[PDB]
Design a protein around this ligand. Structure first.
Ligand code: CLA
Ligand code: CLA
Ligand code: CLA
Ligand code: CLA
Ligand code: CLA
Ligand code: CLA
Ligand code: CLA
Ligand code: CLA
Ligand code: LHG
Ligand code: BCR
Ligand code: SF4
Ligand code: SF4
Lengths: 149, 64, 80, 67, 166, 732, 91
C-alpha cells in the first residue's frame, strides 16, 4: 500500500546514522578505557544490530522511516500479528482454565469461601499441569454439555 | 403436617426476593392455620443486608 | 408530609419502632404471625424521612416502606 | 470517577457481571461488593492529591535542573 | 434412506413420495411450511426438467450454445396468478382435471410409482442444471457438450485439480 | 395557591425550594394538578406553535442586522478578500485602544466578524443586495405573527381538537410524507431553476419580472413530450466565473458530479436534479396508508403479521401499535434518535462535499460549523435514551406487551449489559496500552520501536471509491472492471478528478494515527451506550431495589441501608453519561481540528509523525496553537483577540466552579446556613428586615444538575474560544 | 418513433389489468387488513368526526364494483411507466 521495504529506506538509514552520531557525541567526553566509555560503546553495537535485524526481516517502512504492521492476514506478515496471537490465546486459555478448575474443586466444601484466601497449594499444584491440554479439555466438555450451567 | 418436609431443598418463586430462582434448605414450617408465611428457609449466600434466613408462603416455594 | 406504609410480611421484631427518632411508629396486636403483633404508622405528619426504620427491617425486602412527598417545616427539620 | 459518582450504579453493574460469571461456573464464593460510601470518598481524594503533587513535582524538577 | 444409522425426524415417516428423511437443518417442522416446500419443489423439478433439453439440444444440432416480451410477461403473470388462486392443498401439488387427457391417473399404485419416479428425475435434473451453471463459470463461452467432448479426449478424471489447485 | 399555580405540593412549601422547583417542573405537563389526556395534547400543540414562533423571529434578526450593519454588498464583489460582518458593537465600558482595534472591515466602528457562514449561503441561493435581506426579514416577521395567532386560535374552546385527532397515525404519515417532504422539495427545485441559477449566470430575476422570463429557451415543451434530455444540454463550462455570464451554459438539470473549478462547491444544476428526484420519490411514497378512500395499508395489521413461524422472537410484533400510539415518550425517543443520526451525517457531509460558494476557502467558518453540529448530536442522543428510560418507567404495561420483542428485551437485560462491558474493557485496555507503549518507546529515544498499524480496511474502501494513492487497483480504481464501464460516461470523470485532488477534504489520506484515534472514538461510543442502556434497562428495578418503579424517574437515593444506595435512580444514569458524551465529542473535534489545521498549513507530515504518541498531542497541538490566543492582552497592549482570551478564562472559571457542586454534598451547607440565619437574626439595625421564605440548601438532585450545567458551559465556551482564536489568528 | 400521445396506451393496459385480472386479489387484501384501529376501535367510532369513510364516492353502478378511486389508482401507475419509457429512451 505504497510502503517500501526497510532495507531500501533512505529515511531508515538516516535515522540510524543520526542515532549513531548522537550516541558518539557523548563518547568523546570520557577516556577510551574508562567504564562509562565501555558502557557507551556497548550501546552503539546494540543499535547497529537492531537496525540490521529490522532490515533483515522484510518490515515495511513509509515516508517517515518507521516500520508499519500489516494485520490483514497476508501470508508474508504472519509473524507480525497472527503468530503471536495464537500464543497469547493459548496462554490466556491456560490461565482461565486453571482458574475455572480450581473454583469447581472447592465448591463442594462446607465453607468454600475459606479456600479463596488461604490457597490450598497441594491442590493447586495438581491442577496447574492440567492446563496444558486445555483446548482438548474444553472441546470435549462443550460437546458433552458440561461447559454451561 | 402442613407444608414441605423439613430438610428438603426448595426453589424460591418470589419475584422481589434476593434468592429468586435459588435453592434453599427448609428449617421449620409452622402448623398454625393463621400464619401467612410459615415456611422458614435458609440460604448459603447472604443478601445485601447480611441475612441468610427468610420466611415464605406455601405457594412461593417449589419442591425440587 | 411523607408516607409510611406497613405490609403483611411483618414478623413483629420491634426494631423499626426502636429506631425511629421522632416517635412515628407503634406496635399493635395482630394474629398473623408467631409474635402476634404488627407495626403501625399513625403519626406520619412527624416523619422526617431519615429512613432509619428501613435499615432495621430483617425481611428479604422491607416490610416498612417510606415514600417521600410534600415537605413541610416539620419534615425539613427547621428550627428557625 | 470516584468523586462524582455514587454506589448504586456500580453495584448493579457488578450484579450483571456476576450473572455473566455464574453462567460459566466461575462464580467466586466471596461475593463481590462495590466500595462503601466512605471508602469511595477516600479513594478519590488520595488519587487527586497524588496526581496534583506529582505533576507539580515533575514540572518543578524538570524546569529547574535545565536552567 | 438418506444415510443409514441416523434417526429420522418425526415429520418424515417414509410414507410421502420421494421421502428419504433428509433434513439436516430442520426447515420443515411447521406443516404449512412443509406444504409450501412440497409445492415449490414440484414446480422447480418440472421447470428444470422442461428446461434442460432446451439448453442441450442447440449444441447437439449445431445451432450454438446456451450462452413478444409484453405477451410473455402477460401470459406468465396470468398463469402464475391463476395457479396461486387455487385453494386446495392437494390440488396445488397435482391439479389433475383436464390437464391429463391421457388418463394415467386411473391406476393408484402406478400413480404413486410415477410420482416417485418424477420426483427422483426432478432432483436429478435440478442437480444437472446446477452443474451446467457452475461449469459455465470455470470455462467461459464453452457449452456443456464441448466439455463432455474434452472429457472424452481424456476420460480419466473430473478435471477439478486443474482448477482447485492452480 | 400562590406559586406555582399548577402544583399544590410546592405552593405549601415554606422554604426557597418552592421557587426552584416551580421553575424546574414548569414544562412537565403530566405531573401537574388535575391533568387529562385531552388537556395534555392541547398544551403540547400550543407549545409547538410557540416554538415555531421563535425560530422565525431569530432568523429575522440575523438578516436585519446583516443588512443594516454588514458589508454584504462589498463582500459580494470580492468574496475572497473581504471579512463578513455580523453586527455592530456599542459598549460604554470600551477604552480608546479597543475601539480602534475592533474597527475592521469596511465599517466605521467596532464590528463582529461572522463565522456562521450566512454570507455564502445567501450568496449561493440568489440574494445580491440589502433590499432582498430587508424583504426576507419582513416576511419572517409576518410568519412569526401568523404562528402566534394560530396557536392562540387553537387554544380557544371552540377550536380545540379532540384526543382521537392526535392518534390518527395513518392520516398524518400520508400528509407529512407527500406534503411536507415532497411539495417542499419540489418548490425548492422550482426556486433553484427560476431564481438561483439565472442569478449565478448573471441574470436578475425577481417578483416583478419572473412571469416574463423563460428559465429554459424551450420552455415546458420538452417536459410533456418526454424529451427530458434537452434539459441537460450545453452545461456550464469549466472556465465559468460565478456571478457573471462569461462561460455560462443553458442547462438546468445535469448529473456532472465533482466540484466547480472556481468556487470549489457542488454544481448548482446538480442540486436542482437531486431535489427533483427526492421530491418525486417522496410524493410517490405518500400513498401507502389507508384513509377515508377505502384503499391502503393499516399499520396495526402490518405489525401483527410479522411473526417468525419458528417462534424464536416470541409473539413477534403483536401489540406494538397501541404501545407506540398510547405512549408519547416512545414517540419522542424515536424522533430524537433519527434526528441525532442525521445531524451527525450533516456534520460529516458538509465539510467534505461543500455546497456553498467560497466556503471551502473560509477556514474558520468551516471549522465552526463542524464543531457546532457535532456537539448538538450528542445531546440529542442522550435525550433519546433518557426518554426511552422515562417510557419504560411510566408508559410500559407488562400485560399488553407480553412475550413480544419488548418483553424479551426486558427478559435478558443481563446478557446485553455484560457484553458491552467486555467490548468497552477490551477497547480501552488495548488502546491505552498501545498509546503508552509508543510514549515510552519515543521517550527512551528510539522511535523505530513503535507499534504502528496501517488501517488497511479503510484504505481498501478508499481505493474502491477511486483513490489512487495506495495502488490497490480494485473496482472504480480498476479501468477494466464492470463498475468502471457502467458509469464512465455519466458521472465518473468529475468524481474521479475531484477525489484525486489532494488540496481538498474529500477522502483524505490516513495512517496509523487515524487508526488509533478511530479506536478511541469507538471506545467512547461503546461506553456511553453502555451507561445509557444500563440505566434504561434497570430503570424498572434491580436486585438492590426491586420496586424502583414506584419512586418515579428521579429521586435522590434509598437511604444508607443495605451498604449504601447513592446514585441509584435512572435519572443518575443520564447524569453520568453526559461526561462521557462530552469526552467523546472532544476527542472527535480535537482529531478533526488538528488534522485540518496541519493540512491547511502545508506541513501534513507533522500530524503524520506526532499523532502516534500522547506527548505529541499535548505539545504540538495544545501548547503550540495557544500562543496567539493568550497574547490577546499583555502588559504592553492588546489586539482584536482579547475577547477570545477573556472567553478562554471565563470558561476555565465556570468549569472549575462546577467541581464544587459535583464534589461537596448537602449536609455541610445546611449546617452553615443554620449559623448564618442565627447571625442575621441577632444583629442590630439589620433584624428589622425579615425573609418571607426560609433559606435552605439546594436539594440532592438539584446540585447534580447545577454542577453538570456549570461543567458543560465551561467546556463548550473554552473549546469554542480556543478553536476560533487559533484558526482565525493565522487565516483570518 | 411513436410519440407521447400513443405510448400512453400503457394507461389502457394498466386499467385493463386492474379491472379484469388483479381486481379480486386487491379486494381480498383490503378486507383482510381492514380499517385502522386505535385501542380496538376504528378512528371514526373513537371520536374523530373527520375520519368517516366516504360511501357516496364508493357507490358505483359497475357490475363488479369498480370505482373512481380504483380508476385513479390504476391509471396513475400507467402514466408513471409511460414517462419512464419516454425518459429512458432518447438519451
Ligand atoms: C480465573 C478467573 C476468572 C475467569 C475465568 C474470568 C472470566 C471472565 N470474566 Mg472476569 N474477573 C476476574 C476473574 C476471572 N474472570 C477477576 C478476579 C476480576 C476482578 C478484577 C474480574 C473482572 C471482570 C470484569 C469487570 C468483567 C469480567 C468478564 C469476564 C468474561 C469475559 C472474558 C474475559 O476474560 O473478561 C476479561 C476479564 C478480565 C479483564 C479480568 C482480569 C483477569 C484476572 C486478573 C485474572 C485473575 C485470575 C485469578 C488470580 C485466578 C487464580 C487461580 C489460582 C487459584 C490457581 C469471562 C467469562 C467480563 C464479562 O463478560 O462480564 C462479566 C467483564 O466485563 N471479569
Ligand atoms: C422454458 C424452456 C425454454 C426456454 C426459456 C427457451 C428459451 C430459448 N430457446 Mg429453446 N427450447 C426448449 C425450451 C426452452 N427454450 C425446448 C424444450 C426445446 C426442444 C424443442 C428448445 C429448442 C430450441 C432451439 C432449437 C432453439 C431454441 C432457442 C432459444 C432461445 C431464443 C429463440 C427461441 O427459439 O425462442 C424460445 C423458444 C422456446 C421457448 C431462447 C433463449 C434458439 C437459440 O439457440 O437461441 C439462442 C434455437 O435455435 N430453443
Ligand atoms: C398546523 C395546523 C394544523 C395541523 C391545523 C389543523 C386544523 N385546523 Mg388550523 N390553523 C392553523 C394551523 C394548523 N391547523 C393556523 C396557523 C391558523 C391561522 C390562520 C389556523 C386557523 C384555523 C381555523 C380558523 C380553523 C382551523 C381548523 C382546523 C381543523 C380542521 C381544518 C382541517 O384540517 O381540514 C382541512 C380539510 C381539507 C379538505 C383541506 C384540504 C386542502 C385543500 C385541498 C385546499 C384542523 C384540526 C378549523 C376547525 O374547526 O378547527 C377545529 C377552523 O375553523 N384552523
Ligand atoms: C400537507 C399537510 C401538512 C403539512 C405541511 C403539515 C405541516 C406541519 N405539521 Mg401537521 N398535520 C397534518 C398535515 C400537515 N402538517 C395532518 C393531516 C394532521 C392530522 C393527522 C397533522 C397533525 C399535526 C400535529 C398534531 C402537529 C403537526 C405539526 C406540524 C408542523 C411541524 C413542523 C415540522 O415538521 O418541521 C418542518 C420539518 C421539515 C420540513 C423536515 C425536517 C427534517 C428533514 C429531513 C431535514 C431537511 C433539512 C434540509 C437539509 C434543509 C435544511 C438546510 C437549511 C437550514 C438551509 C408542520 C408545520 C406539529 C406542530 O404543531 O407544529 C407547529 C404538531 O404538533 N401536524
Ligand atoms: C424535542 C426535544 C425535547 C422535548 C420536547 C423534551 C421534553 C421534556 N423533557 Mg427532555 N431532554 C431532551 C429533549 C427534549 N425534552 C434532550 C435532548 C435531553 C438530553 C440533554 C433531555 C433530557 C431530559 C431530562 C433529564 C429530563 C427531561 C424531562 C422532560 C419533560 C419535562 C421537561 C422539564 O421539566 O423541563 C423544564 C425546564 C427546565 C428544567 C429548564 C432546564 C434548563 C437547563 C438547566 C439549561 C438551560 C418534558 C416532557 C424531565 C422529565 O420527563 O422528568 C420526568 C427530565 O427529568 N428531559
Ligand atoms: C482519566 C479518568 C478515567 C479513566 C481512566 C476511566 C476509566 C474507565 N471508566 Mg470511567 N469515568 C470517569 C473518568 C475515567 N474513567 C469520569 C470522570 C466519569 C464521570 C463520573 C466516569 C464514569 C464512568 C462510568 C459511568 C463507567 C466508567 C467505566 C470505566 C471503565 C471502562 C473503560 C475501559 O475500557 O476500561 C479500561 C481500563 C482502564 C483504563 C484501567 C487501566 C488501569 C491499569 C491497567 C492498571 C495497571 C496496573 C496498576 C498500575 C498496578 C497497581 C500499582 C499500585 C501502586 C496501585 C474504565 C476503567 C465503566 C465501567 O467500569 O464499566 C466497564 C462505566 O460504566 N466510567
Ligand atoms: C496492550 C498493550 C501493549 C502491547 C501489545 C505491547 C507489546 C509489546 N511491547 Mg510493550 N508496553 C506497554 C503495552 C503494550 N506493549 C506499556 C503500557 C508499557 C509501559 C510500561 C510498555 C513498555 C514496553 C517496553 C519498555 C518494551 C515493550 C516491548 C514490547 C514488545 C515486546 C516484544 C517481545 O519480544 O516481548 C511488544 C511488541 C519491548 C520491545 O522491544 O518492543 C519493541 C520493550 O523493550 N513494551
Ligand atoms: C473555581 C471554583 C470555585 C469557586 C469560585 C469557589 C468559591 C467559593 N468557595 Mg469553594 N470549592 C470549590 C471550588 C470553588 N469554590 C471546590 C472544587 C471545592 C471542593 C468540594 C470547594 C469547597 C468549598 C468549601 C468547603 C467551602 C467553599 C467556600 C467558598 C466561598 C468562599 C467565601 C467567598 O465568598 O469567597 C469569595 C467569593 C469569590 C472569590 C467568588 C466571586 C468572584 C468574583 C468577585 C465574582 C464577582 C461577580 C459580581 C457579583 C458581578 C456579577 C453580577 C451578575 C449580574 C453577573 C467562595 C464563594 C466556603 C463558603 O461557603 O464560604 C465561606 C466553604 O466553606 N468552597
Ligand atoms: C453446523 C453448525 C450450524 C450451522 C448453521 C448456523 C446457523 C443456524 C441455522 C440457520 C438455518 C436457518 O435457516 O435458520 C432459520 C431460523 C428460523 O427462521 P424462521 O423462524 O423465519 O423460519 C423457521 C421455519 O423455516 C421453520 O420451518 O433462523 C433464522 O431466522 C435465520 C437466522 C440467520 C439469518 C441470517 C440473515 C439475516 C439477514
Ligand atoms: C445503502 C448503503 C449502505 C447502507 C448502510 C446502512 C443500512 C446503515 C445502517 C445503519 C443503522 C441501522 C443505524 C442504526 C442506529 C440505531 C440507533 C441510533 C438506535 C437507537 C436506539 C434508541 C434511542 C432507543 C430508544 C428506546 C429505548 C432505549 C427503550 C424504549 C424504546 C425506545 C425506542 C424509545 C452502506 C453505507 C453500507 C454502503 C453505501 C450504500
Ligand atoms: S423515616 Fe425516620 S422518622 Fe419516619 S418513620 Fe422511619 S425512622 Fe421514623
Ligand atoms: S417493620 Fe420491620 S423491624 Fe418493624 S416489626 Fe415489621 S419487620 Fe420488624
Amino acid at each position: 500500500s505504497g510502503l517500501t521495504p526497510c532495507k531500501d529506506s533512505k529515511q531508515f538509514a538516516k535515522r540510524e546514522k543520526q542515532q549513531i552520531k548522537k550516541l558518539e557525541s557523548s563518547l568523546k567526553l570520557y577516556a577510551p578505557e574508562s567504564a562509562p566509555a565501555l558502557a557507551l560503546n556497548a550501546q552503539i553495537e546494540k543499535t547497529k544490530r537492531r537496525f540490521d535485524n529490522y532490515g533483515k526481516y522484510g518490515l515495511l517502512c513509509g515516508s517517515d522511516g518507521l516500520p508499519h504492521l500489516i494485520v490483514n492476514g497476508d501470508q508474508r506478515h504472519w509473524g507480525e500479528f497472527i503468530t503471536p496471537g495464537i500464543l497469547f490465546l493459548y496462554i490466556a486459555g491456560w490461565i482461565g482454565w486453571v482458574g475455572r478448575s480450581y473454583l469447581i474443586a472447592i465448591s463442594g466444601e462446607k465453607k468454600p469461601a475459606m479456600k479463596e484466601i488461604i490457597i490450598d497449594v497441594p491442590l493447586a499444584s495438581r491442577i496447574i499441569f492440567r492446563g496444558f491440554i486445555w483446548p482438548v479439555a474444553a472441546y470435549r466438555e462443550f460437546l458433552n454439555g458440561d461447559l454451561i450451567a | 403436617p402442613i407444608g414441605p418436609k423439613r430438610g428438603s431443598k426448595v426453589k424460591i418463586l418470589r419475584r422481589e426476593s434476593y434468592w429468586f430462582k435459588n435453592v434453599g434448605s427448609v428449617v421449620a414450617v409452622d402448623q398454625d392455620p393463621k400464619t401467612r408465611y410459615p415456611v422458614v428457609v435458609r440460604f448459603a449466600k447472604v443478601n445485601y443486608a447480611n441475612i441468610s434466613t427468610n420466611n415464605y408462603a406455601l405457594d412461593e416455594v417449589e419442591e425440587v | 408530609s411523607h408516607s409510611v406504609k406497613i405490609y403483611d410480611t411483618c414478623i413483629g421484631c420491634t426494631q423499626c419502632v426502636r429506631a425511629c427518632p421522632t416517635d412515628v411508629l407503634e406496635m399493635i396486636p395482630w394474629d398473623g404471625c408467631k409474635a402476634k403483633q404488627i407495626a403501625s404508622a399513625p403519626r406520619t405528619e412527624d416523619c422526617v424521612g431519615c429512613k432509619r426504620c428501613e435499615s432495621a427491617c430483617p425481611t428479604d425486602f422491607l416490610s416498612v416502606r417510606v415514600y417521600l412527598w410534600h415537605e413541610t417545616t416539620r419534615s425539613m427539620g427547621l428550627a428557625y | 470517577m470516584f468523586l462524582f459518582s455514587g454506589r448504586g450504579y456500580w453495584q448493579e453493574l457488578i450484579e450483571s457481571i456476576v450473572w455473566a460469571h455464574n453462567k460459566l461456573k466461575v462464580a467466586p464464593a466471596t461475593q463481590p461488593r462495590a466500595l462503601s460510601i466512605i471508602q469511595g470518598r477516600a479513594v478519590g481524594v488520595t488519587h487527586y492529591l497524588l496526581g496534583g503533587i506529582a505533576t507539580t513535582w515533575a514540572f518543578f524538577l524538570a524546569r529547574i535542573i535545565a536552567v | 434412506h438418506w444415510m443409514p444409522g441416523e434417526p429420522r425426524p418425526a415429520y418424515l415417516d417414509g410414507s410421502a413420495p420421494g421421502d428419504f428423511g433428509f433434513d439436516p437443518l430442520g426447515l420443515g417442522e411447521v406443516p404449512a411450511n412443509l406444504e409450501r416446500y412440497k409445492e415449490s419443489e414440484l414446480i422447480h423439478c418440472r421447470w428444470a426438467m422442461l428446461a434442460v433439453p432446451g439448453i442441450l439440444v442447440p449444441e447437439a444440432l449445431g445451432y450454438g450454445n446456451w450462452v413478444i416480451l409484453a405477451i410473455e410477461f402477460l401470459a406468465i403473470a396470468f398463469v402464475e396468478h391463476q395457479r396461486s388462486m387455487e385453494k386446495d392443498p392437494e390440488k396445488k401439488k397435482y391439479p389433475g382435471g383436464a390437464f391429463d387427457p391421457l388418463g394415467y391417473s386411473k391406476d393408484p399404485k402406478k400413480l404413486e410409482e410415477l410420482k416417485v419416479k418424477e420426483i427422483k428425475n426432478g432432483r436429478l435434473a435440478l442437480l444437472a442444471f446446477v452443474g451446467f451453471c457452475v461449469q459455465q463459470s470455470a470455462y467461459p463461452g464453452t457449452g456443456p457438450l464441448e466439455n463432455l467432448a474434452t472429457h472424452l479426449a481424456d476420460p480419466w478424471h473430473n478435471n477439478i485439480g486443474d482448477i482447485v489447485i492452480p | 395557591l400562590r406559586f406555582p399555580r399548577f402544583s399544590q405540593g410546592l405552593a405549601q412549601d415554606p422554604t426557597t425550594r418552592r421557587i426552584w422547583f416551580g421553575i424546574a417542573t414548569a414544562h412537565d405537563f403530566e405531573s401537574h394538578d388535575d391533568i387529562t389526556e385531552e388537556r395534555l395534547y392541547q398544551n403540547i400543540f400550543a407549545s409547538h406553535f410557540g416554538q415555531l414562533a421563535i425560530i422565525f423571529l431569530w432568523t429575522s434578526g440575523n438578516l436585519f442586522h446583516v443588512a443594516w450593519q454588514g458589508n454584504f454588498e462589498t463582500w459580494v464583489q470580492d468574496p475572497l478578500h473581504v471579512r463578513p460582518i455580523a453586527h455592530a458593537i456599542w459598549d460604554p465600558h470600551f477604552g480608546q485602544p479597543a475601539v480602534e482595534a475592533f474597527t475592521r472591515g469596511g465599517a466605521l466602528g467596532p464590528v463582529n466578524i461572522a463565522y456562521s457562514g450566512v454570507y455564502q449561503w445567501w450568496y449561493t441561493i440568489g440574494l445580491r443586495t440589502n433590499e432582498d435581506l430587508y424583504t426576507g426579514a419582513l416576511f419572517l416577521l409576518f410568519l412569526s405573527a401568523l404562528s402566534l395567532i394560530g396557536g392562540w386560535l387553537h387554544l380557544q374552546p371552540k377550536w380545540k381538537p379532540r384526543v382521537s385527532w392526535f392518534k390518527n397515525a395513518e392520516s398524518r404519515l400520508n400528509h407529512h410524507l407527500s406534503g411536507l417532504f415532497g411539495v417542499s422539495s419540489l418548490a425548492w427545485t422550482g426556486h433553484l431553476v427560476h431564481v438561483a441559477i439565472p442569478a449565478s449566470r448573471g441574470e436578475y430575476v425577481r417578483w416583478n419580472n419572473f412571469l416574463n422570463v423563460l428559465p429554459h429557451p424551450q420552455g415546458l415543451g420538452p417536459l410533456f413530450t418526454g424529451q427530458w434530455n434537452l434539459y441537460a444540454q450545453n452545461p456550464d463550462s469549466s472556465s465559468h466565473l460565478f456571478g457573471t455570464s462569461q462561460g455560462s451554459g443553458t442547462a438546468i438539470l445535469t448529473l456532472l458530479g465533482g466540484f466547480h473549478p472556481q468556487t470549489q462547491s457542488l454544481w448548482l444544476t446538480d442540486m436542482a436534479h437531486h431535489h427533483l428526484a427526492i421530491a418525486i420519490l417522496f410524493l410517490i411514497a405518500g400513498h401507502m396508508y389507508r384513509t377515508n378512500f377505502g384503499i391502503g395499508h393499516s399499520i396495526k395489521d402490518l405489525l401483527e403479521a410479522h411473526i417468525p413461524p419458528g417462534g424464536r422472537l416470541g409473539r413477534g410484533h403483536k401489540g406494538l401499535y397501541d404501545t407506540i400510539n398510547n405512549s408519547i415518550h416512545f414517540q419522542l425517543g424515536l424522533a430524537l434518535a433519527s434526528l441525532g443520526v442525521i445531524t451527525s451525517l450533516v456534520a460529516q457531509h458538509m465539510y467534505s462535499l461543500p455546497a456553498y460558494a467560497f466556503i471551502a476557502q473560509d477556514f474558520t467558518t468551516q471549522a465552526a460549523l463542524y464543531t457546532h453540529h457535532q456537539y448538538i448530536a450528542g445531546f440529542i442522543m442522550t435525550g433519546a435514551f433518557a426518554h426511552g428510560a422515562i417510557f419504560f418507567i411510566r408508559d410500559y404495561n407488562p400485560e399488553q406487551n407480553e412475550d413480544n420483542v419488548l418483553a424479551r428485551m426486558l427478559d435478558h437485560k443481563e446478557a446485553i449489559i455484560s457484553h458491552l462491558s467486555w467490548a468497552s474493557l477490551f477497547l480501552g485496555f488495548h488502546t491505552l496500552g498501545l498509546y503508552v507503549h509508543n510514549d515510552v518507546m519515543l521517550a527512551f529515544g528510539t522511535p523505530e520501536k513503535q507499534i504502528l498499524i496501517e488501517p488497511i480496511f479503510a484504505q481498501w474502501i478508499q481505493s474502491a471509491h477511486g483513490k489512487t494513492s495506495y495502488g490497490f487497483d480494485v473496482l472504480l480504481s480498476s479501468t477494466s472492471g464492470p463498475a468502471f464501464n457502467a458509469g464512465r460516461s455519466i458521472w465518473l470523470p468529475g468524481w474521479l478528478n475531484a477525489i484525486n485532488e489532494n488540496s481538498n477534504s474529500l477522502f483524505l489520506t490516513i495512517g496509523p494515527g487515524d487508526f488509533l484515534v478511530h479506536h478511541a472514538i469507538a471506545l467512547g461510543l461503546h461506553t456511553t451506550t453502555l451507561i445509557l442502556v444500563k440505566g434504561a434497562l434497570d430503570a424498572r428495578g434491580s436486585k438492590l431495589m426491586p420496586d424502583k418503579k414506584d419512586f418515579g424517574y428521579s429521586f435522590p437515593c434509598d437511604g444508607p441501608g443495605r451498604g449504601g444506595t447513592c446514585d441509584i435512580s435512572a435519572w443518575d444514569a443520564f447524569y453520568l453519561a453526559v461526561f462521557w458524551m462530552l469526552n467523546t465529542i472532544g476527542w472527535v473535534t480535537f482529531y478533526w481540528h488538528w488534522k485540518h489545521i496541519t493540512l491547511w498549513q502545508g506541513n501534513v507530515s507533522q500530524f503524520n509523525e506526532s499523532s502516534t504518541y500522547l506527548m505529541g498531542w499535548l505539545r504540538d497541538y495544545l501548547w503550540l496553537n495557544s500562543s496567539q490566543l493568550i497574547n490577546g492582552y499583555n502588559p504592553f497592549g492588546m489586539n482584536s483577540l482579547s475577547v477570545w482570551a477573556w472567553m478562554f478564562l471565563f470558561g476555565h472559571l465556570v468549569w472549575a466552579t462546577g467541581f464544587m457542586f459535583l464534589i461537596s454534598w448537602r449536609g455541610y451547607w445546611q449546617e452553615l446556613i443554620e449559623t448564618l440565619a442565627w447571625a442575621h437574626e441577632r444583629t442590630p439595625l439589620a433584624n428589622l428586615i425579615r425573609w418571607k421564605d426560609k433559606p435552605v440548601a439546594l436539594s440532592i438532585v438539584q446540585a447534580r444538575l447545577v454542577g453538570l450545567a456549570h461543567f458543560s458551559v465551561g467546556y463548550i465556551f473554552t473549546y469554542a474560544a480556543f478553536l476560533i482564536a487559533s484558526t482565525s489568528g493565522k487565516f483570518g | 418513433l411513436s410519440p407521447s400521445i400513443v405510448i400512453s396506451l400503457s394507461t389502457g393496459l394498466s386499467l385493463f389489468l386492474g379491472r379484469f385480472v388483479f381486481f379480486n386479489f386487491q379486494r381480498e387484501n383490503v378486507a383482510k387488513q381492514g380499517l385502522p384501529e386505535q385501542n380496538g376501535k376504528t378512528h371514526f367510532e373513537a371520536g374523530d368526526d373527520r375520519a368517516k369513510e366516504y360511501v357516496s364516492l364508493l357507490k358505483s353502478n359497475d357490475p363488479i364494483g369498480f370505482n373512481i378511486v380504483d380508476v385513479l389508482a390504476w391509471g396513475s401507475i400507467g402514466h408513471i411507466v409511460a414517462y419512464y419509457i419516454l425518459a429512458t429512451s432518447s438519451n
